[PDB]
Design a protein around this ligand. Sequence first.
Ligand SMILES: [Mg+2]
Ligand SMILES: [Mg+2]
Ligand SMILES: [Mg+2]
Ligand SMILES: [Mg+2]
Ligand SMILES: [Mg+2]
Ligand SMILES: [Mg+2]
Ligand SMILES: [Mg+2]
Ligand SMILES: [Mg+2]
Ligand SMILES: [Mg+2]
Ligand SMILES: [Mg+2]
Ligand SMILES: [Mg+2]
Ligand SMILES: [Mg+2]
Ligand SMILES: [Mg+2]
Ligand SMILES: [Mg+2]
Ligand SMILES: [Mg+2]
Ligand SMILES: [Mg+2]
Ligand SMILES: [Mg+2]
Ligand SMILES: [Mg+2]
Ligand SMILES: [Mg+2]
Ligand SMILES: [Mg+2]
Ligand SMILES: [Mg+2]
Ligand SMILES: [Mg+2]
Ligand SMILES: [Mg+2]
Ligand SMILES: [Mg+2]
Ligand SMILES: [Mg+2]
Ligand SMILES: [Mg+2]
Ligand SMILES: [Mg+2]
Lengths: 57, 97, 55, 164, 203, 145
Amino acid sequence: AEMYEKHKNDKRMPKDLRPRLTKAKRMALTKRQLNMSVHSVCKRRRAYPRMYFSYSE
Amino acid sequence: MRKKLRRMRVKYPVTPLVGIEPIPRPGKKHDWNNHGSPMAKAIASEICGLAPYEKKALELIKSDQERKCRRFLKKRLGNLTRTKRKQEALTAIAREQ
Amino acid sequence: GMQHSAHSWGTGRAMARVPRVSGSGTTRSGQGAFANFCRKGRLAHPTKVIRRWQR
Amino acid sequence: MKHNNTLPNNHFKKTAIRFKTWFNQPAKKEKRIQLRKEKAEKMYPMPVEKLRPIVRCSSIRYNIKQRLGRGFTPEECRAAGLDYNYARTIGIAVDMRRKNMNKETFDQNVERIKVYTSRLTFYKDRKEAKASGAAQHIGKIMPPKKTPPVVQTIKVEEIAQKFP
Amino acid sequence: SASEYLREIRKKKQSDLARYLGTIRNYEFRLNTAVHRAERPTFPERAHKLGYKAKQGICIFRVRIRRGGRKRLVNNGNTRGKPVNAGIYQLKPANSLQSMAELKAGKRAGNLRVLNSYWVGQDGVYKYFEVIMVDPNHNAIRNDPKLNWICKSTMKHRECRGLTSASRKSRGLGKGIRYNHTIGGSRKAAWRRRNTVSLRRYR
Amino acid sequence: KDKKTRKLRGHVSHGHGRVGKHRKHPGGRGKCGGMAHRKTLFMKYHPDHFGKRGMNCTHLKKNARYAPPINVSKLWSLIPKSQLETIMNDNTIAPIINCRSFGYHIVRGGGQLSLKRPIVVMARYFTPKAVSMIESLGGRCIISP
RNA sequence: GACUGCCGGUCUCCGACAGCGGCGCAGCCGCAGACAACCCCCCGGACUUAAGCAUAUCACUAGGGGGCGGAGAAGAAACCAACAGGGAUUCCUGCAGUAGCGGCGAGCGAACAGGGACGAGCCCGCAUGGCAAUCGGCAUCGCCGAGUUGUGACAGCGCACCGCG
RNA sequence: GCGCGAAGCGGUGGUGGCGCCAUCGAAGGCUAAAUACGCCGCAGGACCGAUAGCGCACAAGUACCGCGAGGGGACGGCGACGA
RNA sequence: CAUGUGCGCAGCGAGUCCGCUCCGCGGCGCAGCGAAGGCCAUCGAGCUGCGCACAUGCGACCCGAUAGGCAGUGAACUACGCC
RNA sequence: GGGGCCGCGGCCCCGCUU
Ligand SMILES: [Mg+2]
Ligand SMILES: [Mg+2]
Ligand SMILES: [Mg+2]
Ligand SMILES: [Mg+2]
Ligand SMILES: [Mg+2]
Ligand SMILES: [Mg+2]
Ligand SMILES: [Mg+2]
Ligand SMILES: [Mg+2]
Ligand SMILES: [Mg+2]
Ligand SMILES: [Mg+2]
Ligand SMILES: [Mg+2]
Ligand SMILES: [Mg+2]
Ligand SMILES: [Mg+2]
Ligand SMILES: [Mg+2]
Ligand SMILES: [Mg+2]
Ligand SMILES: [Mg+2]
Ligand SMILES: [Mg+2]
Ligand SMILES: [Mg+2]
Ligand SMILES: [Mg+2]
Ligand SMILES: [Mg+2]
Ligand SMILES: [Mg+2]
Ligand SMILES: [Mg+2]
Ligand SMILES: [Mg+2]
Ligand SMILES: [Mg+2]
Ligand SMILES: [Mg+2]
Ligand SMILES: [Mg+2]
Ligand SMILES: [Mg+2]
């Protein structure tokens, strides 16, 4: 508890105080990084957004 | 009766599309008849000149041996269509000289 | 029943030609293996799940 | 082998031959129904199927019949009045490699988009959409109806007129 | 554009220019070790077509591979088998020589991920390749949306599983009639599907 | 009934003889020996097994070569049952039978037409008796696509 | 707070280094080793079948080497077709024990369709020149670095979830 | 693999060459889902019921043997656990 | 188990087959002949299931070789060489 | 044996070195 509030707002926290997920899960890309797309994919999703509609015959 | 059914074959009468123009497919855009930068091909041909087999095929063309040049370029390139077009690309070199 | 390194000892040893369990020092050693008539042997024509269960 | 029989073509000579049993077949069906229901509940107003074109089948065996195609060409979507990238945002499938071959398949699919977009009600966002109370369409959107072919009839005095 | 002038010069590989630079590059690559880290792409335009950026965390490793086929490694030709399997000396490897270069660059820089590789020279003895290798731990790559796919865990040792451009060519993949050997993802995927008997419940 | 094994319990040499036996593979495996020791089996029951006949077609296409024939007898059976009664009871009305719509490509001339009235038939090919039978009754043989 | 349950702490030593590699790098990181059912890459038998046997077969298997992941691989046509044309991959059905290969012997042997499951599409490179608009690191709003041998782009997530019958 | 080595148009058309016509755009990259699967967890079963069923219902990969790689068993039952 | 054939039984029958799937114009049959070009009947009950016998491939009724291969482990016995 | 193995010079031969 003491060492957490010492190195809470640290650039690199000690390894003790980071959550021990899994070596694979610590090395995973973040959800921000996975959502990163190029400019053409941004403009296309922006100019043609998701539509909410219902069909009936 | 394969040939007879092929000969007696009647196409279904269908109406061709006369009006529309093609939308250019994204990622599939080429002008295949004017492909590269033609200034860039001219510059690199000025710098690099010709290949050694291209120089030998000029010497066959300039010595009135275009028959042997055709056999030589077909053996080099391996394709007859590129062989024909390489020879007329090379006779244009021999004519301007 | 097939989890042994069993081999026939051959003739000449006054014992039947059935595969015997290899090794020594245990009671299983030298005993018959692999055969349907053997104790702890594989049953001949073992039952399969590829049997046609439905009709 | 012994008697008169068809010559055996049984290919179990390889000891590497596997067997794919189907004991999961009733269980996969109930899993497949559950996922389809959960897909319909994830997209509540939107239909679970895309709108797909009517294309003719390829060879001479099958060109008598039409089936449901993969997607509309962008020239079909433009003639219907839509950008094909907009057409994908509503439930229309778009095929960039199908070629606009003839006027009959073209005009049928252009009408098929126009009928579809006329039949749509739009909503502002997802919360407006889920609270609509609109019944969503289950199954293929405007499928080609399979029918036995009706026998056309002409009068016998008209036979020499039509077919000399 | 500049990329066009670099490309048309690169295509002329039998120039007086290219035979000169072929001679001194092949000299310089042969003085270094088998796999050694290059400073920059020899052909930057060719590397840019294969995905190289001038970013931190993208590296160029240079690998040479001895040319020719690969003989069968037995004692004295004794293959201990049928005479159809007794061949030694005109055998060819199933994977490319360029794919061997990615295997050597991949094993050397175990932290990096092999992106692609390209031919930089050859002589009678060696073929020289530069291998584009990407650092999946550098933040310039992980924040890059064109390239952070290689930071995923499914891209560990792409060259060891046949997933780079050079190593994928040996697999027989492709579309259509000529590539029926690999319908299903690979040769083993197609062989597996063709050699199961499908025993349904009601048969 | 039960299997044969349930009756052969008790008898030595289950059903395969004392002097003979049930050995593993006497004669060889499969259909081997078709020219040596099972030649009598192949001279008798499969005399066309060995050898080559005819011109090989590398990749024969089934859908391109699809041309199933229909005899001219069964042409009236293609009319659907509901629609057939208004055609049989109308004599000035002739039916137009697109055989491709019913999956038939060739019309051969086997048997007689079901009714002696004109029918207009569309197919890919008609045999000469199929033309002669249909066009004698006042109908038409039309080569349809 | 007995006996329990759930989760967390502590968690000796041997065993992953002659280490290898990335980033200007006061330093921060990664690789190694395990797993071996599934999957991908390479190497690759012989028994066996052919009533012998050498090609063939077994089998592009077993086995060995390497490498991942929760699946993998594949994948948005330099495809199929020859029609009135279809339209990524994968899987099922089916084509089909067929066309074909084969001491044309033993044997081996696919594909397009049609029907279906499922469905999804995208991107780098030749990006401004009235100014790299981009990124990494830090002791941080300022340096240092990368970079003109050319850098450059955000749509998806999260919580709650009984105690009696 | 080696030799040769392209093009502005090229590839292909069950695959000799050439020509037609037709159809696609390789040699750069990513991509869910349907698909496969052991350990393990869970639930079942016309399964086996202690020589069976996993090698093991038991202090089982144990005892034990082999220089070593490895090999590998046997063995279940009182009662109201109150006497 | 797969695929056949024959017989018996069963349902329907110029048709027949639920069980891939959320829905087979898929197979076979209603007619063959030829290598093919081409010819096309004077003509014919089948399809599917269940059961048995039998053939074949599979470990193939059970048990059995000498062999061959692939991958490993041993110079504590013993052979030689070195320190 | 032929080819590939990218060097200069001079008369297949002779120098040269890179
Ligand atoms: Mg047992
Ligand atoms: Mg650098
Ligand atoms: Mg061998
Ligand atoms: Mg006997
Ligand atoms: Mg008998
Ligand atoms: Mg006898
Ligand atoms: Mg003889
Ligand atoms: Mg490892
Ligand atoms: Mg065997
Ligand atoms: Mg043999
Ligand atoms: Mg034998
Ligand atoms: Mg022998
Ligand atoms: Mg993992
Ligand atoms: Mg993948
Ligand atoms: Mg084979
Ligand atoms: Mg850029
Ligand atoms: Mg109660
Ligand atoms: Mg063309
Ligand atoms: Mg063809
Ligand atoms: Mg591509
Ligand atoms: Mg007992
Ligand atoms: Mg036991
Ligand atoms: Mg001993
Ligand atoms: Mg049998
Ligand atoms: Mg044995
Ligand atoms: Mg041998
Ligand atoms: Mg060995």
